[PDB]
Design a protein around this motif. Structure first.
Motif, mmCIF file in Angstrom:
data_model
loop_
_atom_site.group_PDB
_atom_site.id
_atom_site.type_symbol
_atom_site.label_atom_id
_atom_site.label_comp_id
_atom_site.label_asym_id
_atom_site.label_seq_id
_atom_site.Cartn_x
_atom_site.Cartn_y
_atom_site.Cartn_z
ATOM 1 N N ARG A 31 12.665 49.323 34.535
ATOM 2 C CA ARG A 31 12.938 50.511 35.327
ATOM 3 C C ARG A 31 14.419 50.873 35.461
ATOM 4 N NH1 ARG A 31 8.603 50.028 40.291
ATOM 5 N NH2 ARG A 31 6.696 50.400 39.001
ATOM 6 N N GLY A 32 15.298 50.142 34.791
ATOM 7 C CA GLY A 32 16.690 50.520 34.721
ATOM 8 C C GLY A 32 17.461 50.343 36.027
ATOM 9 N N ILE A 33 17.113 49.311 36.797
ATOM 10 C CA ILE A 33 17.791 49.075 38.076
ATOM 11 C C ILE A 33 19.108 48.384 37.801
ATOM 12 C CG2 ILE A 33 17.739 48.091 40.407
ATOM 13 C CD1 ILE A 33 14.705 48.110 40.328
ATOM 14 N N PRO A 34 20.208 48.855 38.412
ATOM 15 C CA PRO A 34 21.465 48.243 38.003
ATOM 16 C C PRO A 34 21.559 46.792 38.406
ATOM 17 C CG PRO A 34 21.887 50.296 39.128
ATOM 18 C CD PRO A 34 20.408 50.086 39.193
ATOM 19 N N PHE A 35 22.000 45.947 37.485
ATOM 20 C CA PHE A 35 22.382 44.572 37.769
ATOM 21 C C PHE A 35 23.880 44.455 38.080
ATOM 22 C CE2 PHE A 35 18.747 41.829 36.553
ATOM 23 C CZ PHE A 35 17.870 42.817 36.148
ATOM 24 N N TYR A 36 24.211 43.697 39.119
ATOM 25 C CA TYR A 36 25.552 43.214 39.361
ATOM 26 C C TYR A 36 25.828 41.976 38.523
ATOM 27 C CZ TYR A 36 29.673 41.480 41.752
ATOM 28 O OH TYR A 36 30.931 41.004 42.040
ATOM 29 N N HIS A 37 24.833 41.107 38.433
ATOM 30 C CA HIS A 37 24.907 39.895 37.613
ATOM 31 C C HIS A 37 23.560 39.649 36.953
ATOM 32 C CE1 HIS A 37 26.077 35.941 36.198
ATOM 33 N NE2 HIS A 37 27.278 36.084 36.730
ATOM 34 N N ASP A 38 23.536 39.534 35.618
ATOM 35 C CA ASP A 38 22.285 39.330 34.924
ATOM 36 C C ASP A 38 21.800 37.886 35.128
ATOM 37 O OD1 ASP A 38 20.025 39.831 33.195
ATOM 38 O OD2 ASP A 38 21.249 40.948 31.761
ATOM 39 N N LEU A 39 20.612 37.606 34.626
ATOM 40 C CA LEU A 39 19.961 36.319 34.747
ATOM 41 C C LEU A 39 20.910 35.194 34.383
ATOM 42 C CD1 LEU A 39 17.095 35.254 35.498
ATOM 43 C CD2 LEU A 39 16.537 35.407 33.049
ATOM 44 N N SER A 40 21.003 34.222 35.295
ATOM 45 C CA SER A 40 21.929 33.107 35.199
ATOM 46 C C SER A 40 21.412 31.884 35.960
ATOM 47 C CB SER A 40 23.288 33.537 35.755
ATOM 48 O OG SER A 40 24.301 32.599 35.453
ATOM 49 N N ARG A 41 22.150 30.784 35.863
ATOM 50 C CA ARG A 41 21.871 29.531 36.584
ATOM 51 C C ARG A 41 23.032 29.204 37.506
ATOM 52 N NH1 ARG A 41 18.189 26.321 33.593
ATOM 53 N NH2 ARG A 41 16.950 27.867 32.417
ATOM 54 N N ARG A 42 22.717 28.695 38.681
ATOM 55 C CA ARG A 42 23.710 28.273 39.629
ATOM 56 C C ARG A 42 23.359 26.809 39.967
ATOM 57 N NH1 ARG A 42 28.164 28.580 43.412
ATOM 58 N NH2 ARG A 42 28.662 27.987 41.244
ATOM 59 N N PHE A 43 24.398 25.995 40.190
ATOM 60 C CA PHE A 43 24.301 24.529 40.250
ATOM 61 C C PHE A 43 23.567 23.897 39.069
ATOM 62 C CE2 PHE A 43 24.266 25.700 44.942
ATOM 63 C CZ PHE A 43 25.657 25.683 45.026
ATOM 64 N N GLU A 44 23.901 24.332 37.862
ATOM 65 C CA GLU A 44 23.253 23.832 36.641
ATOM 66 C C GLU A 44 23.206 22.288 36.518
ATOM 67 O OE1 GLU A 44 21.265 24.715 33.201
ATOM 68 O OE2 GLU A 44 22.894 26.219 33.252
ATOM 69 N N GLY A 45 22.045 21.739 36.122
ATOM 70 C CA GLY A 45 21.852 20.283 35.965
ATOM 71 C C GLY A 45 21.674 19.458 37.249
ATOM 72 N N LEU A 46 22.008 20.061 38.392
ATOM 73 C CA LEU A 46 21.904 19.417 39.694
ATOM 74 C C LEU A 46 20.507 19.606 40.253
ATOM 75 C CD1 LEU A 46 25.287 20.371 41.399
ATOM 76 C CD2 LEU A 46 24.697 18.558 39.694
ATOM 77 N N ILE A 47 20.142 18.763 41.210
ATOM 78 C CA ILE A 47 18.806 18.840 41.757
ATOM 79 C C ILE A 47 18.542 20.238 42.341
ATOM 80 C CG2 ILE A 47 17.227 17.925 43.489
ATOM 81 C CD1 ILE A 47 17.495 16.180 41.004
ATOM 82 N N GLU A 48 19.572 20.854 42.929
ATOM 83 C CA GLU A 48 19.430 22.182 43.573
ATOM 84 C C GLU A 48 19.682 23.373 42.633
ATOM 85 O OE1 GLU A 48 21.756 19.687 44.232
ATOM 86 O OE2 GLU A 48 23.150 20.460 45.802
ATOM 87 N N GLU A 49 19.622 23.128 41.319
ATOM 88 C CA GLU A 49 19.692 24.182 40.343
ATOM 89 C C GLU A 49 18.690 25.294 40.605
ATOM 90 O OE1 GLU A 49 19.494 22.993 36.211
ATOM 91 O OE2 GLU A 49 19.900 25.060 35.557
ATOM 92 N N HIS A 50 19.146 26.537 40.463
ATOM 93 C CA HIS A 50 18.230 27.667 40.558
ATOM 94 C C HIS A 50 18.586 28.793 39.575
ATOM 95 C CE1 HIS A 50 21.450 27.874 43.649
ATOM 96 N NE2 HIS A 50 21.429 29.190 43.509
ATOM 97 N N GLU A 51 17.566 29.520 39.085
ATOM 98 C CA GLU A 51 17.783 30.757 38.346
ATOM 99 C C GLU A 51 18.086 31.839 39.340
ATOM 100 O OE1 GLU A 51 15.021 29.947 34.341
ATOM 101 O OE2 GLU A 51 15.400 31.958 35.040
ATOM 102 N N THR A 52 18.943 32.787 38.957
ATOM 103 C CA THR A 52 19.392 33.829 39.864
ATOM 104 C C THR A 52 19.668 35.114 39.074
ATOM 105 O OG1 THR A 52 21.172 34.397 41.416
ATOM 106 C CG2 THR A 52 21.755 33.141 39.503
#
Lengths: 132, 132, 132, 132, 132, 132, 132, 132
Positions: free
Chosen positions: B88-109
């Motif tokens: 639907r063409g909604i603007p992204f500020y930041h595209d699909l990424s990982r935060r806290f990579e490799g750590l137990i609390e890693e999440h996609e964002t």
């Protein structure tokens, strides 16, 4: 109604993380989840509140356009929180008040205020369909 | 589980209410609840979002210290919303990424951005205990 | 199903409350609820654990007759916690193993050990009826 | 709130398994699940209690640092249990009492005591957010 | 969904209460609730079964018109119970079979037989609407 | 508590299926599910009752050792059923009565009786833990 | 989630009540609740459908503006019902198809037709947010 | 009881979609979901109502054989809706009334009427088993 398996998450500024901990955990009774040098994360009534170390907190505050909190289906939960805030010395930006008075969507409200001038509003709607 | 009978509620600024409707309802797929001259209220993934007509929206945007959204327990819900935003063409500020990579609390964002520069972040944690 | 509205609560000795915080909150990922000079209270996987400041902790540890923990219905939760314990360097008393092997009540098990020699056991049963 | 699909599990010493059965099943009303030469397992209010044949039970007991039980959201369940304990001749280590009096976290409590001097505490919190 | 807060209850004859205990608790894995000189009560897969001491049990057994049991929504629960019955040597009246084969209301079925010739039938329906 | 996704199923004799339909559906208010030449199946308070065409119904009946029905957590549901049975002309084998009087497990009871002399017992326990 | 404790109810015309029973109960697998000279009431997938004896049924049928049915979250439920309709020879107005193909709100759909030309539509959405 | 994860869906004619929006959203308090040139979709008390642009609305209306709405388990929800309809100027086809008076299945009712003469009936049953 909402999915009990998801969480709402909000990020807000905190000028000092120890000071934020005292407000949200020690006084408000939220649970401390994760702590980093630059942020603390909280179980804020079952949703996630993250307090980010920041200088970009509001130096002066007014009710609009930013505030957050919980709308309780059960008035007892609303009343308990009000009592807790009064007993634990939590500052109120606005004490117990009705909004949208005389409308079907009338709700009872109070606003707490954190040390970095973030406004917390808690609500109870007399018709539970009006919670959105 | 959070209480499915309560709702989190958030207030944010909207420079124009019709434009906010176009973003949140027409494109993002939220449901419109109530409208007033100074605000619109939304069923935002089962929580309440209120867009307040205001000139106090950020002209310059950075990730911190303010953003909001949903953390999904089920990755399918996260993936569906990303696909929706893209199609639907909604603007992204930041595209699909990982935060806290490799750590137990890693999440996609990923972060979306509304017309008044409010930042929406959606997350999925690989270990569901790390949602707080 | 057990009542989701109640909590089990357990009291155990802690030789040092800060050290207990480091173990249960920082490493194990439990949430800190309340603190007093003589105890800390924890949201321990949704039940309540209270660590009491005490010199009556076991200096010599054996598996029986005292230990506690969670039995997970979903193996993913069990596997996630094992991975967490391993990655974050939480001491094991007994590494991943099977108890009642080949029998209907077979379960996977691992034991962690807190700084005051309290034994935490986590379990997963292959037949969910055998959780009692 | 907690996952209704999981169970808390606790292991405690019992000097005599038939004597433990009489206390936990016949008097307290817990359900007997599994029985072995060296232990009995119980459905203890929806969580799992395991009584291990042992000589390592406390010969003298004090309130701290070890005790366990259930915190009830519904006062009726707490009151029913108190009534049952009184009618069925179950010994009380400490009769009905308030703890943390005058605090928001005030709770009503009673302690039962099993034949091997394990202490059972049952709690009701006047503010349900204080259950952790 | 049926009301999870209610229970179905059934009374059946038992020629000998200890023998009924051995069958329902020790082998089948039900939990023992209450015992009296003339009956035992059981948590039978979350419903209540009461075995009444009686000489009016059927000496000659046929499938109809009396039998009872559980219909499982999740095939894993059905498969687990079959495996349990087989491993623990519980007598079958009828081994694993299909009833209404090829029809929309097709279900897998097996029958166990208790020491007083009561017939237990467990079922799994391929279309969950056909459980009634 | 029990799994709301499963159903208890019971088979009982009926001398005449139309007569069974009038009792269970027309008078008692159960829902008719499936009908065959040799049996009718019913949604019996959320569990499954199957009435099998049979000559093997009890010509004379006594309370023990066979009867079935529902134990209601909510007294209103019990009271409503009693009222319905009285207004709809449903025969009572035993009118409203207490059993295990003065015990913690005391319960209120009534017995209805179907045209083939099957006994239906409905129960309410004053302590909900006594429902098993 | 919608409130599981409420029901949607719909009234539609039936030219003949026995014929409506044959369609909704015998073939479609709904459960019969109540019957009167002028109507029958049905447990229609957990909601209430009432077929009113009436001559005001549509002799000429088109898809719009009237039809009803269920939107299933779980595709297995949708697939099971299609298979049921096919095997049991229930007339289709429109066979299995896609509506809004390729769009976020794409859904699988089929339409059945009752003997009085009421149109039943069953749907499954690829993104569950699009169910409204 | 019904699956909270599914939705009932109904299609009805609307002569004018803006006029339908004012009735269902602005006055009745339903949530607006999706809008197209030829239809609007609504979150109608948790089920889906779709209003199709049409000339085939009923020019004259009577109670039977077509109407729809919600049967509420909780009388407060029924009473709240009645109050809302009165305060918001929503027209009643039939004001508050009892139907099937003196029967076990007696229910309280009111009928609202939309601008295209669709009839909405809201119901409360004094015995909740009579909701089908």
């Amino acid at each position: 109604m909402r999915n009990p398996n998801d969480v709402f998450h909000l990020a807000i500024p905190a000028r000092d993380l120890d000071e934020a901990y005292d407000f949200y955990v020690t006084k408000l009774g939220c649970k401390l989840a994760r702590r980093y040098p630059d942020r603390i994360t909280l179980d804020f009534f079952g949703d996630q509140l993250v307090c980010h170390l920041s200088d970009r907190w509001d130096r002066e505050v007014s009710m609009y356009p930013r505030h957050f909190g919980i709308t309780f289906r059960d008035k007892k939960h609303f009343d308990n929180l009000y009592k807790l805030a009064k007993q634990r010395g939590i500052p109120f930006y606005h004490d117990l008040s009705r909004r949208f008075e005389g409308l079907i969507e009338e709700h009872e409200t109070f606003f707490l205020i954190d040390p970095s001038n973030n406004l917390l509003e808690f609500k109870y709607y007399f018709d539970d369909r009006m919670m959105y």
